[PDB]
């Protein structure tokens, strides 16, 4: 079971084994636990009842994450494979997943100053930086989506990071994330760096809608036919035009017409600079 990244080949033997004795589970978060090794960690467990194939997949995602080195990709602290159940130790992300965060932290009468446009643009920039790192190292994520991004904390200093690599791990139907996929992925099973660009546009829509499911009211098959025919999502409520434009550029039908992440980053930067953009009020959910 070998994995190749950035020029180097690796095996599970390369994974940093942490003695099971040094690991204490604190509480459940989702299975995933808050743990201590005193370094605080997230502990991903492999159910003992699963297959030898699931165990192989489990270990492969460990290897994949451990070989990344970037601030916007969750760190792997190590593993505990000498005991059952098997543990993967990850950077603890106290802010939780991004979709849940957006939904739970939406501006409302309780506190209309929960989030502002700049907060959303910073999350977008954070994930775009992670995606650019994957792009420049020729890694295709295949499932860029709010559910797979994590926050270091709920508060204003939060940093967003790509936290799940299960789809890339498998690749290395009713469950396929069709709503995040470009046509050539849909129809031909073709994946490139521009695959992730399309998904990032959908992620941007998720962010600026404050956590709505993409293509609201549409089923997967309806979305497939919609997108193939040239259909695209409308802007999220109150979304500034410059931000919607990034989305529509990401969703160009031809992959060669979609921006790479370096371009996406510079466009996100330009948005953060425009006072008209960042002074735009987010909708208050009543």
Curated annotation (Swiss-Prot):
Residue ranges of domain Protein kinase in the record: 23-277
Write the protein's name. Answer: ALK tyrosine kinase receptor
Q: How does it assemble?
A: Homodimer; homodimerizes following heparin- and ligand-binding. Interacts with CBL, IRS1, PIK3R1 and PLCG1. Interacts with FRS2 and SHC1. Interacts with PTN and MDK.
Q: What are the binding positions for ATP in this chain?
A: 44, 91-93, 164
Q: What is the effect of changing residue 128 to T?
A: In NBLST3; somatic mutation
Q: Which family does it belong to?
A: Belongs to the protein kinase superfamily. Tyr protein kinase family. Insulin receptor subfamily.
Query: Domain of life of the organism in this record?
Result: Eukaryota
Name the gene: ALK
Question: Where does the entry say this protein is expressed, by tissue?
Answer: Expressed in brain and CNS. Also expressed in the small intestine and testis, but not in normal lymphoid cells.
PTMs? Phosphorylated at tyrosine residues by autocatalysis, which activates kinase activity. In cells not stimulated by a ligand, receptor protein tyrosine phosphatase beta and zeta complex (PTPRB/PTPRZ1) dephosphorylates ALK at the sites in ALK that are undergoing autophosphorylation through autoactivation.
What happens after mutating residue 169 to Q?
A: In NBLST3; constitutively activated; retained in the endoplasmic reticulum and Golgi compartments
Q: What does this protein do?
A: Neuronal receptor tyrosine kinase that is essentially and transiently expressed in specific regions of the central and peripheral nervous systems and plays an important role in the genesis and differentiation of the nervous system. Also acts as a key thinness protein involved in the resistance to weight gain: in hypothalamic neurons, controls energy expenditure acting as a negative regulator of white adipose tissue lipolysis and sympathetic tone to fine-tune energy homeostasis.
Subcellular localization(s) per the UniProt record: Cell membrane
Q: Which disease is it linked to?
A: A chromosomal aberration involving ALK is found in a form of non-Hodgkin lymphoma. Translocation t(2;5)(p23;q35) with NPM1. The resulting chimeric NPM1-ALK protein homodimerize and the kinase becomes constitutively activated. The constitutively active fusion proteins are responsible for 5-10% of non-Hodgkin lymphomas.
């Amino acid at each position: 079971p070998n994995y190749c990244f950035a020029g180097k080949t690796s095996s599970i033997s390369d994974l940093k084994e942490v003695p099971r004795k040094n690991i204490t589970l604190i509480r459940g978060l989702g299975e995933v636990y808050e743990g201590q090794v005193p370094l605080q960690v997230a502990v991903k467990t492999l159910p003992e009842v699963y297959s030898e194939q699931d165990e192989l997949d489990f270990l492969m995602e460990a290897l994949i994450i451990s070989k990344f080195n970037h601030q916007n990709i969750v760190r792997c602290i190590g593993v505990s494979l000498q005991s059952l159940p098997r543990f993967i130790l990850l950077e603890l992300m106290a802010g939780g997943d991004l979709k849940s965060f957006l939904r739970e932290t939406r501006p409302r009468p309780s506190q209309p100053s929960s989030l502002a446009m700049l907060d959303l643009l910073h999350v977008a920039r954070d994930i775009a930086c992670g995606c650019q790192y994957l792009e420049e190292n020729h890694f295709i994520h295949r499932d860029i989506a709010a559910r797979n991004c994590l926050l270091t904390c709920p508060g204003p200093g939060r940093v967003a990071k790509i936290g799940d690599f299960g789809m890339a791990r498998d690749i290395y139907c009713a469950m396929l994330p069709v709503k995040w996929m470009p046509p050539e992925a849909f129809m031909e099973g073709i994946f490139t760096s521009k695959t992730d660009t399309w998904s990032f546009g959908v992620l941007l829509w998720e962010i600026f809608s404050l956590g709505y499911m993409p293509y609201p009211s549409k089923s997967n098959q309806e979305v497939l036919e919609f997108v193939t025919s040239g259909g695209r999502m409308d802007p999220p409520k109150n979304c500034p035009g410059p931000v919607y434009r990034i989305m529509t550029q990401c969703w160009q039908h031809q992959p060669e017409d979609r921006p790479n992440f370096a371009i996406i980053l510079e466009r996100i930067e330009y948005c953060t600079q425009d006072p008209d953009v960042i002074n735009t009020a987010l909708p208050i959910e009543y």
